Amino acid sequence: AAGELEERFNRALNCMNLPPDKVQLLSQYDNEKKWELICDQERFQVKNPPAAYIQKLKSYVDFKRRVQESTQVLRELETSLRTNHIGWVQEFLNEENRGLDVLLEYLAFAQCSVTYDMSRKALRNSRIVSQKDDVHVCIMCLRAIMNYQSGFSLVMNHPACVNEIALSLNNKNPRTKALVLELLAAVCLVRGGHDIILAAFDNFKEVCGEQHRFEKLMEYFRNEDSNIDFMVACMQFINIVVHSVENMNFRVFLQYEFTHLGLDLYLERLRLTESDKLQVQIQAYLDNIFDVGALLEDTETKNAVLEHMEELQEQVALLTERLRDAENES
Amino acid sequence: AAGELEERFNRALNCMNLPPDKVQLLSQYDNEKKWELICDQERFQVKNPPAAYIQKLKSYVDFKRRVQESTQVLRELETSLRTNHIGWVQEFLNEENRGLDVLLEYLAFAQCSVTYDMKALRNSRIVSQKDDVHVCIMCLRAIMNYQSGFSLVMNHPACVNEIALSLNNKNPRTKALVLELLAAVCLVRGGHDIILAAFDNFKEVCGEQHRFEKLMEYFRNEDSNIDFMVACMQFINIVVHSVENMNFRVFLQYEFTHLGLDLYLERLRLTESDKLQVQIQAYLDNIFDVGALLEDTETKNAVLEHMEELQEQVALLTERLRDAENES
Amino acid sequence: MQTIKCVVVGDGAVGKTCLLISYTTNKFPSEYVPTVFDNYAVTVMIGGEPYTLGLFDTAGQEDYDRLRPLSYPQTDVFLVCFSVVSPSSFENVKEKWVPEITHHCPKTPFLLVGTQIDLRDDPSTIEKLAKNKQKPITPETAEKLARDLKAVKYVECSALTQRGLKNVFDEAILAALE
Amino acid sequence: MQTIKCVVVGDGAVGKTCLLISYTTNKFPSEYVPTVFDNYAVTVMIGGEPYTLGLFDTAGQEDYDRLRPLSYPQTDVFLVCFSVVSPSSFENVKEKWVPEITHHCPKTPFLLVGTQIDLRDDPSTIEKLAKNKQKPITPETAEKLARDLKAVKYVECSALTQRGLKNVFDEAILAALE
Ligand SMILES: Nc1nc2c(ncn2[C@@H]2O[C@H](COP(=O)(O)OP(=O)(O)NP(=O)(O)O)[C@@H](O)[C@H]2O)c(=O)[nH]1
Ligand SMILES: Nc1nc2c(ncn2[C@@H]2O[C@H](COP(=O)(O)OP(=O)(O)NP(=O)(O)O)[C@@H](O)[C@H]2O)c(=O)[nH]1
Ligand SMILES: [Mg+2]
Ligand SMILES: [Mg+2]
């Protein structure tokens, strides 16, 4: 237990990808329960390198059902991405291993039967893997990659990456849908990130063969009343996409875009629920809604109170003319 | 030389489709110069019945020209709809003849050569000659001169959507007439919702990304014909600001801004055409700026609290001046 | 005896009525009135034989499209009119008027008639027309039109200056007898 | 000297730390502290032999996901926890927790442990849950689950009313030695 100056402590504290928030609380620990940590890091070892997972997943891309044990491989990769030292993620994502790509093409593979019921050699081989958890586990891996600062930046600069995630809303499981919306919601608020989400739904419009932007978002939100936690993340995504905008002419464009899709008359019926997160998310959206008519009526005409304010402006002056004359009568 | 002729005159007057404006401007004639009208009316005869044209036109739909006289037969068909007594029109458009239908059937036949530039085709490319096809629009414009027929145009589904498709024709005179036509239907009650459904149809059949975007290409890139630009600019100004709801106005306004309307209009404000400059400036005064409108709304409430600051400052000040005047 | 029926058709405000009044009484009128229908009668001499010349004035505006063909029956010669300084009025000849009269009165000879030649040199119309990027019709362009529309001949005149005005009706009468 | 290492994992505010503190001491804490990691040691006798029982308390918050697995090496038995009144805690057993412990330490036995049994009948927990269209987790559904995930056994517990609490840890020592 050698006592140097303890910045051997610094190395394992970074390499744990902890918010600066939590580094303030943790760095001010006792000296023993500080070095005691350092040596647990050095004793801890990683079971498998990222290449090991990469290979077995790339092979899944080309009877069959030899992939049956795939689901666990994805689950053991997610666990590896989320809980290992941050380097394991970088090694997974660098040019050599090229992890994001091979990961993304597998998701595209499992998901080409659900984007279609609405490359065929697989198309058949797609329906069986779509049943599985694979589609939903894969998204959990991206969720893991995007909490990592450098990896999150690598995702937005990838064209197809976010675009495939928008298609990941079609999976039949309500929990999966909700995850996609929280994720796409997140990418939406970063600078310049807003246009990438729309372009994803633009692609989403054609590949699903839908009339208007979204409108498929609107249907899953509208016709399903089963899951409470889905709508919460759903409703807040809509609240984001509309009122976060720079230009307010574009905001009201967007409000109508949803209004036309029957958002407003559905939300009046959905306002009855007292699910707290939902009661808050709905009312949060309604407080932000715009009405150009309303802004126009109270900018009606003349602004004649300006000269009623000028009658007041003339009154203070005249009153003061009598008070300075009072200093003279004094 | 009937001694009590009033009844006849009226019967052969409203069968002339005269506006209330022009029909009693006329009602005050000499009694002799009223009889004179009544007797030319019955002395005038219709050469050919509407069924005659239906047939010769319906048969044009199926190498060399039985469509030779098409251009002129359609052309005198237009003439007959416009200048014959309104009774002739009622008969042409009625259910037995179903004239509006068969007419629409032929235009579609001729204009599938022009919509497929930007089944068996056979005779359509030659019939696509601009004179054969364009008169057809004039036949419609004539039908829309008659009140009952104009409503008949609006409740026929394909009709208005079909007229919008004729915007693809390469002739500037044709384009302008289409736009002039669509403009009228757009402002009549509920007619705005009918025009949208027409251009929505236009988007899918032309295979384009945004809705009235093939239009924006036509408006921008041709500087040859001025009166086209006039009819075009007027169609756009109507479709955006004629609407009741003001949220829908800025929604529609934004969609055009996206099509690069405002950036083209900055250069087009330069023209020294009187007729276009007036229609352009009319659109420019009507534009909304939601940013500006919120800023002057804050201002209002803040001057309310400065008017409360003025109402409070005058109160304290005048109350202290009376306390000094009493201490005197 | 005999009579010659002549109907003047043409766009509104081409100067049809002034054309008929600056001919018969040589007085050029100040007042603008949208003419509904009117009838004038003048006796004219050809080869020592008295003809009664029928002059029919019709409306130009589209409201009387249903009324106008009442003047058409028994017409011996038509006058299709436009102004040389209004291209709008010009192309309505091919679009409206010529097809209108050839429907109602086929095999009836007609002359193509240009009016307001005096404004072809007018300064205020120079700029007004050029501002909308168009120019008045040269004598070359109209007589190539009359040759296509199977018109008898093309004549132009100004009711104001009366220049070639009498010439209009006389070349018109000659066509009336065929 | 021999020792039995036991690690407690589970979602945040599920009641892991109260489970360990209301066991070793009989004082039930109300105070909420988000534990980063902690260590406890109590000597327990098995077959009349003194074994030293190691209890490791780990973080629930997803911020310490990279910090937590330092407590895992050489773990003899796990305690995987969810709350019977929070289904959220329930489904994270399969998507997050069980696959996490079986990645780092495969072939290491674990117990499925439901906490906070006392609120299964409490009105305000019934209503708060029913308002979001949910129902507390039945004892049937928890062992419906346990077999599938290859858990040793399902034992349930409440730290507030110490109850069936001693039984959990006995069953944990029980899985540790085989
Ligand atoms: N400079 C000029 N003005 C003319 C000429 N002919 C007519 N005008 C004018 O143009 C205006 C319309 O003329 P008018 O004869 O009433 O036209 P019209 O074709 O009979 N119109 P409508 O069909 O409405 O009765 C009048 O103010 C008249 O003075 C012309 O040769 N030169
Ligand atoms: N009703 C009831 N509440 C409990 C029980 N156990 C813990 N709690 C409460 O649940 C809340 C969270 O308990 P705690 O022991 O801090 O949870 P933890 O698993 O250690 N959370 P973390 O991982 O964040 O440190 C606390 O307010 C505590 O009082 C229980 O058995 N019954
Ligand atoms: Mg006249
Ligand atoms: Mg704790």
Side-chain angles (χ1 to χ4, degrees), chain A residues 31 35-41 43, chain D residues 37 39:
Chain A
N31 41 266
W35 184 84
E36 153 178 337
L37 179 71
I38 297 174
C39 51
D40 312 332
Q41 164 72 42
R43 293 186 211 188
Chain D
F37 72 96
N39 183 346

PDB file of all heavy atoms in Angstrom, chain A residues 31-41 43, chain D residues 37 39, unseen atoms left out:
ATOM      1  N   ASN A  31      -8.301   8.307   2.296  1.00  0.00           N
ATOM      2  CA  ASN A  31      -7.110   7.859   1.587  1.00  0.00           C
ATOM      3  C   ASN A  31      -7.022   6.354   1.345  1.00  0.00           C
ATOM      4  O   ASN A  31      -6.491   5.924   0.320  1.00  0.00           O
ATOM      5  CB  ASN A  31      -5.849   8.313   2.334  1.00  0.00           C
ATOM      6  CG  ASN A  31      -5.969   8.174   3.844  1.00  0.00           C
ATOM      7  OD1 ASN A  31      -6.337   9.126   4.536  1.00  0.00           O
ATOM      8  ND2 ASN A  31      -5.637   6.996   4.363  1.00  0.00           N
ATOM      9  N   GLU A  32      -7.502   5.550   2.286  1.00  0.00           N
ATOM     10  CA  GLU A  32      -7.448   4.108   2.103  1.00  0.00           C
ATOM     11  C   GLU A  32      -8.514   3.651   1.111  1.00  0.00           C
ATOM     12  O   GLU A  32      -8.211   2.941   0.154  1.00  0.00           O
ATOM     13  CB  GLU A  32      -7.616   3.392   3.438  1.00  0.00           C
ATOM     14  N   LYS A  33      -9.745   4.123   1.287  1.00  0.00           N
ATOM     15  CA  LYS A  33     -10.831   3.744   0.387  1.00  0.00           C
ATOM     16  C   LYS A  33     -10.676   4.472  -0.938  1.00  0.00           C
ATOM     17  O   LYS A  33     -11.610   4.540  -1.734  1.00  0.00           O
ATOM     18  CB  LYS A  33     -12.197   4.046   1.010  1.00  0.00           C
ATOM     19  N   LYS A  34      -9.489   5.031  -1.150  1.00  0.00           N
ATOM     20  CA  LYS A  34      -9.119   5.614  -2.427  1.00  0.00           C
ATOM     21  C   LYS A  34      -8.092   4.755  -3.156  1.00  0.00           C
ATOM     22  O   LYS A  34      -8.256   4.466  -4.336  1.00  0.00           O
ATOM     23  CB  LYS A  34      -8.566   7.021  -2.205  1.00  0.00           C
ATOM     24  CG  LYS A  34      -8.400   7.863  -3.441  1.00  0.00           C
ATOM     25  N   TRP A  35      -7.032   4.350  -2.463  1.00  0.00           N
ATOM     26  CA  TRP A  35      -6.067   3.433  -3.065  1.00  0.00           C
ATOM     27  C   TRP A  35      -6.673   2.040  -3.192  1.00  0.00           C
ATOM     28  O   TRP A  35      -6.348   1.292  -4.110  1.00  0.00           O
ATOM     29  CB  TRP A  35      -4.763   3.366  -2.274  1.00  0.00           C
ATOM     30  CG  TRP A  35      -3.742   2.481  -2.952  1.00  0.00           C
ATOM     31  CD1 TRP A  35      -2.891   2.848  -3.964  1.00  0.00           C
ATOM     32  CD2 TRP A  35      -3.474   1.101  -2.688  1.00  0.00           C
ATOM     33  NE1 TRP A  35      -2.110   1.784  -4.340  1.00  0.00           N
ATOM     34  CE2 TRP A  35      -2.445   0.699  -3.574  1.00  0.00           C
ATOM     35  CE3 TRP A  35      -3.998   0.165  -1.789  1.00  0.00           C
ATOM     36  CZ2 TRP A  35      -1.936  -0.597  -3.586  1.00  0.00           C
ATOM     37  CZ3 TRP A  35      -3.491  -1.121  -1.801  1.00  0.00           C
ATOM     38  CH2 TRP A  35      -2.470  -1.491  -2.695  1.00  0.00           C
ATOM     39  N   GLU A  36      -7.538   1.691  -2.245  1.00  0.00           N
ATOM     40  CA  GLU A  36      -8.201   0.392  -2.246  1.00  0.00           C
ATOM     41  C   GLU A  36      -8.941   0.204  -3.557  1.00  0.00           C
ATOM     42  O   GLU A  36      -8.984  -0.888  -4.112  1.00  0.00           O
ATOM     43  CB  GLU A  36      -9.160   0.291  -1.065  1.00  0.00           C
ATOM     44  CG  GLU A  36     -10.338  -0.650  -1.242  1.00  0.00           C
ATOM     45  CD  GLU A  36     -11.211  -0.716   0.001  1.00  0.00           C
ATOM     46  OE1 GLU A  36     -10.705  -0.398   1.100  1.00  0.00           O
ATOM     47  OE2 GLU A  36     -12.410  -1.047  -0.127  1.00  0.00           O
ATOM     48  N   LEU A  37      -9.464   1.303  -4.079  1.00  0.00           N
ATOM     49  CA  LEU A  37     -10.084   1.325  -5.395  1.00  0.00           C
ATOM     50  C   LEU A  37      -9.093   1.073  -6.523  1.00  0.00           C
ATOM     51  O   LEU A  37      -9.329   0.235  -7.391  1.00  0.00           O
ATOM     52  CB  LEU A  37     -10.761   2.675  -5.621  1.00  0.00           C
ATOM     53  CG  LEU A  37     -11.437   2.846  -6.980  1.00  0.00           C
ATOM     54  CD1 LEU A  37     -12.680   1.995  -7.085  1.00  0.00           C
ATOM     55  CD2 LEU A  37     -11.753   4.311  -7.236  1.00  0.00           C
ATOM     56  N   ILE A  38      -7.988   1.812  -6.504  1.00  0.00           N
ATOM     57  CA  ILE A  38      -6.968   1.717  -7.542  1.00  0.00           C
ATOM     58  C   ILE A  38      -6.537   0.287  -7.845  1.00  0.00           C
ATOM     59  O   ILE A  38      -6.367  -0.081  -9.006  1.00  0.00           O
ATOM     60  CB  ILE A  38      -5.697   2.500  -7.152  1.00  0.00           C
ATOM     61  CG1 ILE A  38      -5.979   3.991  -6.998  1.00  0.00           C
ATOM     62  CG2 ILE A  38      -4.598   2.295  -8.178  1.00  0.00           C
ATOM     63  CD1 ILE A  38      -4.785   4.757  -6.479  1.00  0.00           C
ATOM     64  N   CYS A  39      -6.415  -0.535  -6.812  1.00  0.00           N
ATOM     65  CA  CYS A  39      -5.903  -1.879  -7.012  1.00  0.00           C
ATOM     66  C   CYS A  39      -7.002  -2.864  -7.400  1.00  0.00           C
ATOM     67  O   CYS A  39      -6.707  -3.899  -7.993  1.00  0.00           O
ATOM     68  CB  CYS A  39      -5.153  -2.352  -5.759  1.00  0.00           C
ATOM     69  SG  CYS A  39      -6.072  -2.168  -4.220  1.00  0.00           S
ATOM     70  N   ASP A  40      -8.260  -2.539  -7.103  1.00  0.00           N
ATOM     71  CA  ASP A  40      -9.368  -3.312  -7.672  1.00  0.00           C
ATOM     72  C   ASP A  40      -9.478  -3.114  -9.177  1.00  0.00           C
ATOM     73  O   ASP A  40      -9.856  -4.038  -9.899  1.00  0.00           O
ATOM     74  CB  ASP A  40     -10.694  -2.961  -6.994  1.00  0.00           C
ATOM     75  CG  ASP A  40     -10.588  -2.974  -5.494  1.00  0.00           C
ATOM     76  OD1 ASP A  40      -9.734  -3.726  -4.977  1.00  0.00           O
ATOM     77  OD2 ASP A  40     -11.354  -2.252  -4.826  1.00  0.00           O
ATOM     78  N   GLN A  41      -9.150  -1.917  -9.650  1.00  0.00           N
ATOM     79  CA  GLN A  41      -9.121  -1.670 -11.081  1.00  0.00           C
ATOM     80  C   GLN A  41      -8.045  -2.514 -11.738  1.00  0.00           C
ATOM     81  O   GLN A  41      -8.287  -3.164 -12.755  1.00  0.00           O
ATOM     82  CB  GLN A  41      -8.879  -0.204 -11.407  1.00  0.00           C
ATOM     83  CG  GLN A  41      -8.464  -0.011 -12.864  1.00  0.00           C
ATOM     84  CD  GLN A  41      -9.604  -0.216 -13.853  1.00  0.00           C
ATOM     85  OE1 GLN A  41     -10.726   0.236 -13.627  1.00  0.00           O
ATOM     86  NE2 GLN A  41      -9.316  -0.902 -14.958  1.00  0.00           N
ATOM     87  N   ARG A  43      -6.737  -5.201 -10.691  1.00  0.00           N
ATOM     88  CA  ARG A  43      -7.012  -6.635 -10.606  1.00  0.00           C
ATOM     89  C   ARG A  43      -8.113  -7.074 -11.566  1.00  0.00           C
ATOM     90  O   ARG A  43      -8.231  -8.258 -11.884  1.00  0.00           O
ATOM     91  CB  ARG A  43      -7.426  -7.049  -9.189  1.00  0.00           C
ATOM     92  CG  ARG A  43      -6.368  -6.955  -8.111  1.00  0.00           C
ATOM     93  CD  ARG A  43      -6.923  -7.543  -6.821  1.00  0.00           C
ATOM     94  NE  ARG A  43      -6.376  -6.905  -5.628  1.00  0.00           N
ATOM     95  CZ  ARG A  43      -6.577  -7.344  -4.389  1.00  0.00           C
ATOM     96  NH1 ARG A  43      -7.306  -8.433  -4.178  1.00  0.00           N
ATOM     97  NH2 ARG A  43      -6.045  -6.698  -3.361  1.00  0.00           N
TER      98      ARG A  43
ATOM     99  N   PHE D  37     -20.218   2.404  -3.288  1.00  0.00           N
ATOM    100  CA  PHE D  37     -19.938   1.011  -2.946  1.00  0.00           C
ATOM    101  C   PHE D  37     -19.646   0.993  -1.448  1.00  0.00           C
ATOM    102  O   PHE D  37     -19.186   1.989  -0.894  1.00  0.00           O
ATOM    103  CB  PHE D  37     -18.797   0.394  -3.782  1.00  0.00           C
ATOM    104  CG  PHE D  37     -17.412   0.899  -3.460  1.00  0.00           C
ATOM    105  CD1 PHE D  37     -16.599   0.191  -2.583  1.00  0.00           C
ATOM    106  CD2 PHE D  37     -16.891   2.025  -4.084  1.00  0.00           C
ATOM    107  CE1 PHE D  37     -15.313   0.618  -2.299  1.00  0.00           C
ATOM    108  CE2 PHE D  37     -15.601   2.459  -3.802  1.00  0.00           C
ATOM    109  CZ  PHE D  37     -14.812   1.753  -2.908  1.00  0.00           C
ATOM    110  N   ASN D  39     -18.890  -1.971   2.186  1.00  0.00           N
ATOM    111  CA  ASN D  39     -18.422  -3.271   2.622  1.00  0.00           C
ATOM    112  C   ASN D  39     -18.891  -3.569   4.044  1.00  0.00           C
ATOM    113  O   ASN D  39     -18.799  -2.715   4.928  1.00  0.00           O
ATOM    114  CB  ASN D  39     -16.896  -3.309   2.522  1.00  0.00           C
ATOM    115  CG  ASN D  39     -16.309  -4.660   2.885  1.00  0.00           C
ATOM    116  OD1 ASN D  39     -16.981  -5.525   3.450  1.00  0.00           O
ATOM    117  ND2 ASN D  39     -15.032  -4.845   2.560  1.00  0.00           N
TER     118      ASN D  39
END
